[PDB]
Design a protein around this motif. Structure first.
Motif, PDB file in Angstrom:
ATOM      1  N   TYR A  73       0.808  -1.205   0.000  1.00 50.37           N
ATOM      2  CA  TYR A  73       0.000   0.000   0.000  1.00 50.37           C
ATOM      3  C   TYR A  73       0.845   1.261   0.000  1.00 50.37           C
ATOM      4  O   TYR A  73       0.372   2.310  -0.449  1.00 50.37           O
TER       5      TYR A  73
ATOM      6  N   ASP B  87      -0.263   4.354  -3.152  1.00 54.60           N
ATOM      7  CA  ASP B  87      -0.538   5.784  -3.209  1.00 54.60           C
ATOM      8  C   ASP B  87       0.292   6.503  -4.259  1.00 54.60           C
ATOM      9  O   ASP B  87      -0.061   7.623  -4.635  1.00 54.60           O
TER      10      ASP B  87
ATOM     11  N   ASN C 266      -1.913   6.522  -7.320  1.00 48.98           N
ATOM     12  CA  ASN C 266      -2.939   7.538  -7.105  1.00 48.98           C
ATOM     13  C   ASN C 266      -2.307   8.834  -6.616  1.00 48.98           C
ATOM     14  O   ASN C 266      -2.755   9.444  -5.644  1.00 48.98           O
ATOM     15  N   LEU C 267      -1.233   9.257  -7.266  1.00 48.12           N
ATOM     16  CA  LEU C 267      -0.734  10.603  -7.032  1.00 48.12           C
ATOM     17  C   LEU C 267      -0.165  11.241  -8.287  1.00 48.12           C
ATOM     18  O   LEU C 267       0.198  12.418  -8.245  1.00 48.12           O
TER      19      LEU C 267
END
Lengths: 257, 65, 140
Positions: B33, B37, B40-41
Motif C-alpha cells: 500500500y 498511493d 494515485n498521485l
C-alpha cells in the motif's frame, strides 16, 4: 483515298461500321506524310483542310455516341490543328461551336481553372458575337454570384444542338453541391424544402435520393442524419514534436564551431 | 542519465512485484500500500493543465524568439 | 484614374455606374492585358458586402440581409451565404430554422498554441540569417 466524305452523317448516324471506316480513314491520313513541320506548301495544307474536316466529323460522331474519353481525344487533336505554327488556313466555319463543345464539357467536369485559361485565345468573339462561346461564359457567370436558378431556367435555350450530354452531367454536378450544402448536420426538413433547395415538386428524383441516400419521407418529414464530427482534442499531445522543435534550435546555435 | 536511472529504479520495482505477485516469496504488506498511493498521485492532463501550459510555454518562448 | 474610380464603384453597390466605367475605360483595360476582370470581378460585387456585413454584424437575420444586400428576395440569401461559407468567405454558420446567420466562437488566439507557430517561423528565419552571414563574411 478520298474515303466516304458524307456517307452516314448528313442524314443519320446510328452506325458503328463507318466509325471503323473513319478509323481506316485515320489510317490513310496519318500515313500520308505527317503534320509536324508545316513549313510552307499550301499543297500539303490541302489535306490539312481534309484532316481537320474529318476530325470535325469525328468530333460530331463522338458526342453523338455518348463517349467521354474519346471526345476529348479528338478535340485535343483538333485543338492541336488550331495549334498550327504556320497558319494561313482559311476559316473552317465549325470552329467556334467546336470550342463551345469543349468549353461546356470542361465546365461540366469542374475544370474551372482550365476553363478560364482556355478563354485567352479569343480576341473579341466572347463579347461582340458568337453565342456558342457566349453561352458557357454567361453560364459560368451565373455560377458565380448566387444564381443557381438561372442556370436551370436558361437550360432550355441553345443555339446549337441540345448539348444534352454536357448539361445533364453539368446539372448533376450542381445537384451534389446543393446536396453537399444540405447534407450537413442540420437535421430535418420537409418535402417543400426539397422543392425549393433540391428541386422538383413530386418527381422520380425524390425516389432517387430515397434509394441512393436516406432523406426518406416519413410523416411529411425528411430525416438527414448528423454529419457532425467528434473533435477529440488534447492539443498538449504536440509534446514530443514540441520537445523535438526545441532541440534543433540549440543544435543550430551550436555544432558549427 | 537522470532519466536512464528512472527506468533503472523502475526495472527494479518491476522485478519485485513480478517475483512476489507471481508467487515465490512471502508478501510484505507494508510495501504494497506504500506503493499504492504512488499510482494515485500522478497528475493527469485536463483543460486547466492545457490552457495554462501554453500560457507559459509561449511566455518562455517570447524571450527566446 | 481608372482603377481608383473602379474600386469607387466596387465598394458601392452600384452597377450601372460600373458598366459606365467599362464603356469609358475598356480600351485601357484591353491595353493592360486584363480583359478577364469583367467575368471575375462581377462575382465580388455581391461578395464584398456580405463579407462586410459578416465582419460588422454578429448574428443577422437572413430576412434582413436581403434588403441590406438589395437582393430583392429573402429566399436565395441562403444560397449566397452558402456560397460564402463553402468557398470560405466567412467562418459563420446558418441556422436553417428561423433565419440566423451566427458568427464564430470567442477569440482565443493566445492560449491555443497559435503564438508558437508564428514564433517558430521567426526563429527559423532569423538564425538562418546568422548562419548564412558567418559563412559569407569570412573569405580570407
Amino acid at each position: 483515298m478520298y474515303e466516304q466524305l458524307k456517307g452516314e452523317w448528313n442524314r443519320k448516324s446510328p452506325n458503328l461500321s463507318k466509325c471503323g471506316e473513319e478509323l481506316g480513314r485515320l489510317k490513310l491520313v496519318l500515313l500520308e506524310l505527317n503534320f509536324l513541320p508545316t513549313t510552307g506548301t499550301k499543297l500539303t495544307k490541302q489535306q490539312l483542310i481534309l484532316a481537320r474536316d474529318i476530325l470535325e466529323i469525328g468530333a460530331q460522331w463522338s458526342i453523338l455516341r455518348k463517349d467521354i474519353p474519346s471526345f476529348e481525344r479528338y478535340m485535343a487533336q483538333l485543338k492541336c490543328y488550331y495549334f498550327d505554327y504556320k497558319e494561313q488556313l482559311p476559316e473552317s466555319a465549325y470552329m467556334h461551336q467546336l470550342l463551345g463543345l469543349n468549353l461546356l464539357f470542361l465546365l461540366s467536369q469542374n475544370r474551372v481553372a482550365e476553363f478560364h485559361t482556355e478563354l485567352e485565345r479569343l480576341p473579341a468573339k466572347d463579347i461582340q458575337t458568337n453565342v456558342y462561346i457566349k453561352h458557357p461564359v454567361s453560364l459560368e457567370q451565373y455560377l458565380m454570384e448566387g444564381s443557381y436558378n438561372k442556370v436551370f431556367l436558361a437550360k432550355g435555350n441553345i443555339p446549337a444542338e441540345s448539348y444534352t450530354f454536357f448539361i445533364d452531367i453539368l446539372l448533376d454536378t450542381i445537384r451534389d453541391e446543393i446536396a453537399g450544402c444540405i447534407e450537413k448536420a442540420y437535421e430535418k426538413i420537409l418535402f417543400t424544402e426539397a422543392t425549393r433547395i433540391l428541386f422538383f415538386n413530386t418527381p422520380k428524383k425524390m425516389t432517387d435520393y430515397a434509394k441512393k441516400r436516406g432523406w426518406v419521407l416519413g410523416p411529411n418529414n425528411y430525416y438527414s442524419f448528423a454529419s457532425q464530427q467528434q473533435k477529440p482534442e488534447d492539443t498538449t499531445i504536440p509534446s514530443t514534436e514540441l520537445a523535438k522543435q526545441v532541440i534543433e534550435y540549440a543544435r543550430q546555435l551550436e555544432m558549427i564551431v | 542519465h537522470g532519466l536512464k536511472g528512472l527506468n533503472s529504479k523502475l526495472l527494479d520495482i518491476r522485478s519485485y512485484l513480478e517475483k512476489v505477485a507471481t508467487g515465490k516469496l512471502p508478501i510484505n504488506h507494508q510495501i504494497i500500500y506504500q506503493l499504492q498511493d504512488v499510482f494515485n498521485l500522478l497528475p493527469d492532463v485536463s483543460l486547466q493543465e492545457f490552457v495554462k501550459a501554453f500560457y507559459l510555454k509561449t511566455n518562455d518562448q517570447m524571450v527566446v524568439v | 484614374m481608372p482603377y481608383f474610380l473602379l474600386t469607387q464603384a466596387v465598394r458601392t453597390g452600384n452597377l450601372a455606374k460600373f458598366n459606365q466605367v467599362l464603356d469609358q475605360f475598356g480600351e485601357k483595360f484591353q491595353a493592360d492585358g486584363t480583359y478577364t476582370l469583367i467575368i471575375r470581378l462581377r462575382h465580388n460585387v455581391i461578395k464584398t458586402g456580405v463579407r462586410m456585413i459578416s465582419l460588422s454584424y454578429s448574428r443577422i437575420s437572413l430576412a434582413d440581409i436581403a434588403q441590406k444586400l438589395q437582393l430583392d428576395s429573402p429566399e436565395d440569401a441562403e444560397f449566397i451565404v452558402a456560397k460564402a461559407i463553402r468557398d470560405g468567405v466567412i467562418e459563420a454558420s446558418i441556422n436553417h430554422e428561423k433565419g440566423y446567420v451566427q458568427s464564430k466562437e470567442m477569440i482565443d488566439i493566445y492560449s491555443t498554441r497559435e503564438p508558437q507557430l508564428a514564433f517558430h517561423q521567426r526563429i527559423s528565419f532569423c538564425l538562418d540569417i546568422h548562419n548564412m552571414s558567418v559563412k559569407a563574411m569570412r573569405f580570407p
